Symmetry: C2
Subunit: 256 residues, 2 copies
């Protein structure tokens, strides 16, 4: 079967992270959309204009709004993209055939929206050469970050080639987790986000979303299906592109 | 010998085009800077804010200004980047050890700054699915363009891999040649631009800067040295990366 995949990058990244996966999925016959979220990739906003994870998600919500009735998509979120998935599913659950989490945060419906981010920061507290700043938007103080180049090399892009790491140095931008804003946000709903099919893809060689964290997430909020990719690194869509495409084909054949 | 190379992308592109070349040059021991010009790559401006090729060049001029006395660089410009080189050389000639033109426009000092662009448009008049728009800045009507995806596939990225073409679809932005503004600009000077060493690198398999055009440029304004790369396509820094690095090493050993 063929599907329409919507690929959702993580914070400080953009659609460019999907540059290897998108043509492979198209070569299987699928339709693929790779979005830039707000203030990401070549989106024209700067992060200091964005006040919440919900505002950050606007391009994904606008895309989903534009789907004609009856058209469903499979969302694929890497790393922090799982939060964009949860936000989107609470507005457009009927348009979502399934969500695929790719070394991603897996929010739940029992705890506040910041819960899994808070846990990540306990498991992985040292962000190396990452820098931080603050800005104010809509009366709140937001902590922004710019991912450190050593962190990128060692922890996110561990086994990627030098030309892929170079793209990350060139293209990663300032971003935010909006952690304190998430902590005050209404919970994700059981009727919307809770109702979608959820497929969790990971590798135990991820050097930032460490096995303790990912296995904790799986136990916290049971996925419909789990796929463990052997080897690779946090950027499986670069280091294990073919394996990711094969999994996504199976998802397209299972959920519609 | 080691040099400091400053890599200069073409219109509608950004530093990202150099993602393969930059690590190869660093692996030879060089220092490499790959700039985003105005309204290009992840630069925060939009093209409608930019009124001339000189304004477009600001990041290159600002970079050159910041070099301490006595430090020289080798400029490397692809495609339209040769115009940025000429602009820069008329302000900072003493900071430029040499300029390398990479399937690039080669402005002169005898004719108006638009001369080689006007010629290009005669040799290559059909830009396929490229779209155009106009905007006004500083009282002039500027023609902007967005490179067509078929043009990108067939003429610019002819022999590049699907993942490289995908990056171009994701990252190329609206831009301008500022052709009518160039046509009114004071000529490039013999004392500044005319005085720098100029190395012309090309392939006769370029499907946009066709052999008639490139050989015309070489005859029009004799380079100090010409290197012809066999095979490849217009994006030699993607299809012939190693050969480009080898040439640049020789340039670093010849000009300081």
């Amino acid at each position: 079967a063929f599907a329409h995949f919507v690929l959702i990058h993580t914070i400080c990244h953009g659609a460019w992270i999907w540059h290897k996966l998108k043509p492979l999925l198209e070569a299987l016959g699928h339709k693929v959309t790779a979005l830039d979220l707000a203030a990401s990739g070549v989106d024209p906003r700067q992060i200091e204009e964005i006040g919440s994870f919900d505002e950050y998600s606007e391009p994904l919500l606008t895309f989903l709004e534009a789907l004609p009735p009856g058209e469903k998509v499979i969302l694929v979120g890497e790393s922090c993209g799982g939060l964009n998935i949860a936000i989107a599913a609470d507005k457009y659950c009927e348009k979502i055939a399934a969500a695929v989490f790719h070394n991603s945060v897996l929010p739940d419906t029992e705890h506040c929206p910041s819960y899994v981010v808070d846990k990540l920061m306990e498991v992985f507290p040292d962000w190396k050469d990452t820098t931080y700043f603050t800005y104010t938007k809509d009366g709140k103080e937001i902590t922004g970050l710019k991912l450190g180049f050593t962190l990128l090399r060692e922890n996110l892009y561990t086994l990627c080639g030098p030309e892929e790491y170079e793209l990350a140095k060139m293209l990663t931008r300032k971003g935010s987790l909006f952690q304190n804003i998430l902590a005050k946000r209404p919970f994700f709903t059981k009727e919307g986000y809770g109702s979608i099919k959820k497929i969790y893809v990971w590798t135990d060689q991820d050097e930032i979303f460490l096995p303790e964290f990912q296995l904790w997430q799986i136990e916290n909020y049971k996925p419909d299906k789990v796929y463990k990719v052997e080897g690779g690194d946090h950027k499986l869509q670069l280091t294990k592109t073919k394996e990711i495409a094969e999994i996504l084909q199976e998802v397209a054949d299972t959920y519609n």
